[PDB]
Amino acid sequence: AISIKTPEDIEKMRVAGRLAAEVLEMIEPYVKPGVSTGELDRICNDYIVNEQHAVSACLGYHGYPKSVCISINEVVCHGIPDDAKLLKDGDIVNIDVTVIKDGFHGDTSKMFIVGKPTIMGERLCRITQESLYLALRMVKPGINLREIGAAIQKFVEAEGFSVVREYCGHGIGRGFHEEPQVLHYDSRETNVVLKPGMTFTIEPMVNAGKKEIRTMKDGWTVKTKDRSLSAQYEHTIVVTDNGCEILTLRKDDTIPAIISH
Numbered sequence: 001a002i003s004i005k006t007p008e009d010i011e012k013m014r015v016a017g018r019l020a021a022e023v024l025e026m027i028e029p030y031v032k033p034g035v036s037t038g039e040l041d042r043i044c045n046d047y048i049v050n051e052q053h054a055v056s057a058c059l060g061y062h063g064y065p066k067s068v069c070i071s072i073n074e075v076v077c078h079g080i081p082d083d084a085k086l087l088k089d090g091d092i093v094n095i096d097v098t099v100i101k102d103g104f105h106g107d108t109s110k111m112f113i114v115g116k117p118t119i120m121g122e123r124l125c126r127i128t129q130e131s132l133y134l135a136l137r138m139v140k141p142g143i144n145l146r147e148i149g150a151a152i153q154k155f156v157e158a159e160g161f162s163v164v165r166e167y168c169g170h171g172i173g174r175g176f177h178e179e180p181q182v183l184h185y186d187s188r189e190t191n192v193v194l195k196p197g198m199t200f201t202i203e204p205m206v207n208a209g210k211k212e213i214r215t216m217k218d219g220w221t222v223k224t225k226d227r228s229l230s231a232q233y234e235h236t237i238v239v240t241d242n243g244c245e246i247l248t249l250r251k252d253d254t255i256p257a258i259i260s261h
C-alpha cells in the first residue's frame with residue numbers, strides 16, 4: 001500500500017525539502033546561551049510564513065501547539081518550545097522542521113550543541129549523524145527496509161549506545177506521515193521492498209543510556225526513562241533507479257545529495 005511519486009511530485013518535494021533545510025541553516029546563529037526555545041520557534045515560523053511563502057506542517061497538527069519541535073538533552077522528540085526554556089552551555093538541542101509548499105512536505109532535523117560541548121554530548125551527536133549517513137548509503141531499489149534498521153542498530157550499539165523503539169521515521173508526501181513506518185532497529189514487523197519513486201524519512205533517535213522512554217504530562221513530550229541524553233538527525237529521501245536522492249541537504253552536511261550504486 002505505498003504509492004510512488006511521479007517526477008512532477010518529486011520536484012515539488014525538492015522545493016519543500018530545500019525550504020526545510022534552509023530553516024535549519026537560517027536558525028543556527030540564533031542558537032546560543034540564554035535564548036528561549038519560544039524565541040527560536042517564533043523566528044522559524046516568521047521565516048517560513050513571511051520569507052519562504054510557505055507553512056509549517058507542525059503548527060496545529062493534531063493539536064501540536066508550535067511551529068517546530070525543539071528537544072534538549074534527555075528529551076527524545078516532540079519537545080515543545082517555551083518562552084521560559086533558556087538554552088544553556090553544554091546543552092544538546094534538536095530542531096525538527098517540516099514545511100509544506102505547493103501541497104508537498106519536507107521534514108528534516110539536526111543537533112546543535114550550545115557553547116562548549118561536554119564529552120558525552122559531542123560523541124552522542126556524532127554517532128547519531130553517522131548512523132543516519134550509514135542508512136542513507138544503503139537506500140536503493142530492491143532492498144528491504146528492514147536491512148536499514150538492522151544496520152542502524154548494529155552500528156549504534158557497537159558505540160555503546162541505545163536505539164529508541166517506540167518512535168520512527170515515516171513515508172511523507174502530500175501527507176506529513178504516510179506509509180511506510182521506518183524503524184531504526186531490526187524487527188520482524190518490517191517487510192517492505194524499496195522501489196523508485198518511494199519517498200520517506202530516516203530519523204534515528206539514539207540514547208546515551210538505555211533505550212526506554214516515557215511520555216510527559218503534556219502528552220507530546222517524550223523523555224528518556226533513565227534520564228540519559230538523547231539525540232537525533234533526519235533527512236527526507238526519494239528512492240531512484242540506482243540509489244537515492246536526499247532532498248533536505250544543508251551546506252554543513254558531509255555527503256552528496258545523490259547516492260549511486
Ligand SMILES: C[C@H](NC(=O)Cc1cc(F)cc(F)c1)C(=O)N[C@H]1CC=C[C@H](c2ccccc2)N(C)C1=O
Nearest residue numbers: 058061064068069077078096166167168169170177
Ligand atoms: C519522531 C517523529 N517526529 C516527527 O514526525 C516530528 C513531529 C513534529 C510535530 F510537530 C508533531 C508530530 F506529531 C511529529 C514521529 O513522530 N514519528 C512518528 C511517525 C508516525 C506515527 C507515530 C506518531 C506518534 C505520535 C505523534 C505523531 C505520530 N509515531 C509513533 C511516530 O513515531
Ligand SMILES: [Mn+2]
Nearest residue numbers: 107169201203
Ligand atoms: Mn520526520
